[PDB]
Design a binder for this molecule. Structure first.
Ligand SMILES: O=c1ccn([C@@H]2O[C@H](COP(=O)(O)OP(=O)(O)NP(=O)(O)O)[C@@H](O)[C@H]2O)c(=O)[nH]1
Ligand SMILES: [Ca+2]
Length: 420
């Protein structure tokens, strides 16, 4: 049972993770065959957080790369491909300073080239890449690309695919198979996988990741209220204004330090979040928001990353159902109305992120209902999960599959034309 391995470093805005994948040498073009073998969480921030100290970006990777030498057998190092892909942290740094961006990419490249893996490059993914590759990960792992049935009796229509919603720290993606006509080339994706054509919609909303949304709501609370209606009553902190306004995401919203306190006001919080979504103009037949084309959502979806972490909080810590859009809205209201002592009574251990759940839950409720136009019928088809077949869901597996060429466009010998 001879195995091959492959490695991806996912260099997100808030963290870097390393995934090591393994697969049998001679079944390697089978769908769903590649699985996660191990992973590692790099300590500290994302590589973009070393914008002004680029050499620390390369050093941040060492510990996880030392784990990869132990995870992958030594005789396979030389032939195990290694990739780094970076997402919206580096896309935002690139708007601010393409030179500092280059110096960070150079430092991670220098570090990664000292290791004995087959290093295939450090790249910034486009928004489209990031959305499509997570869609391919989820569907590959759940075996949605198998042609179901047998000769003389193929299931029709073919097996549906799972849409993907990824809430990262600095951008959010929505990607799904659609029968609707394309109206914007930047959203239009055509894939050829195991002999089949998939027509796909994708969009990445830069600045609509969790950390950037929190920063925009804070900038907005500062300007409109001088209290934060999404923060819990009893919670307060010293806000450093230069950190609030240095993001490309908040420059458009412009004393070194101001005290700001929560007020547990679910209604004002909802009003605050609503201003994130411009619904006033659409140059297409229909839009999601901000003038962006989007056909009707359809089919099942998996919502992972911060959709999952936030729903996990509402169900596991607050003990509240989130099965319907109306329950998610009630759960957000109850969470937002909690005072800071009440929220802390529920969380015996570390309290990081605790003051932010109200704002994040509220954004997610609005994003799904107002931004993407899910309703009770389509929302019922959404599941919140972060893992499929023992593999973390994300873009890293899909990316690895594509660059290593492990998903054939067509089946061998076209399977004798038996799927025509
Ligand atoms: O366990 C966790 C880990 C991360 N998070 C937060 O979820 C958000 C999304 O995390 P992520 O690792 O999917 O984002 P990312 O760093 O890959 N950011 P991007 O994908 O480059 O935009 C972040 O704000 C992170 O702080 C949790 O809430 N709980
Ligand atoms: Ca990410």
């Amino acid at each position: 049972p001879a195995l091959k391995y492959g490695i991806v470093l996912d260099a997100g805005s808030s963290h870097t993770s390393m995934f090591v994948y393994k697969w049998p040498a001679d079944k390697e073009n089978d769908t769903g065959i590649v699985g996660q073998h191990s992973s590692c969480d790099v300590q500290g921030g994302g590589i973009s957080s070393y914008a002004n100290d680029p050499s620390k970006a390369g050093q941040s990777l060492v510990r996880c790369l030392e784990q990869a030498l132990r995870d992958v057998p030594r005789d396979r190092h030389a032939s195990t491909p290694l990739y780094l892909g970076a997402t919206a942290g580096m896309r935002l740094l690139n708007l601010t300073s393409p030179e500092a961006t280059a110096r960070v990419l150079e430092a991670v490249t220098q570090t990664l080239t000292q290791y004995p893996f087959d290093f295939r490059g450090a790249r910034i993914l486009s928004g489209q890449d990031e959305g499509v590759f997570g869609w391919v990960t989820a569907n590959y792992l759940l075996e949605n690309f198998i042609k179901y049935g047998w000769v003389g009796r193929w299931i029709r229509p073919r097996k549906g695919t799972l849409g993907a919603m990824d809430l990262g720290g600095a951008s959010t993606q929505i990607t799904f198979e659609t029968t609707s006509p394309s109206e914007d080339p930047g959203n239009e994706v055509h894939l050829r996988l195991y002999g089949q054509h998939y027509r796909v919609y994708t969009h990445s909303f830069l600045c609509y990741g969790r950390d950037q949304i929190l920063l925009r709501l804070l900038a907005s609370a500062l300007q409109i209220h001088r209290f934060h209606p999404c923060w819990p009553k009893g919670y307060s902190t010293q806000v450093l204004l230069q950190e609030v306004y240095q993001s490309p995401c908040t420059m458009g919203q412009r004393s070194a330090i101001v005290s700001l306190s929560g007020t547990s006001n679910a209604t004002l919080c909802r009003d605050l979040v609503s201003r994130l979504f411009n619904i006033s103009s659409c140059p297409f037949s229909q839009c999601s928001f901000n003038g962006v084309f989007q056909p009707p959502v359809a089919g099942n979806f998996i919502a992972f990353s911060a959709f999952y972490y936030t729903v996990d909080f509402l169900t596991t810590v607050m003990g509240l159902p989130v099965g319907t859009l109306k329950q998610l809205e009630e759960a957000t209201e109850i969470t937002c109305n909690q005072t800071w002592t009440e929220l802390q009574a529920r969380v015996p251990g570390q309290k990081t992120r605790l003051a932010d759940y109200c704002a994040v839950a509220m954004f997610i409720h609005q994003l799904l209902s107002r931004g993407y136009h899910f309703d009770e019928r389509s929302f019922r088809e959404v599941v919140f999960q972060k893992k499929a077949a023992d593999t973390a869901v994300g873009w890293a597996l899909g990316y690895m599959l594509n660059l290593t060429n492990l998903i054939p466009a067509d089946l061998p010998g076209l399977r004798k034309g038996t799927h025509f």
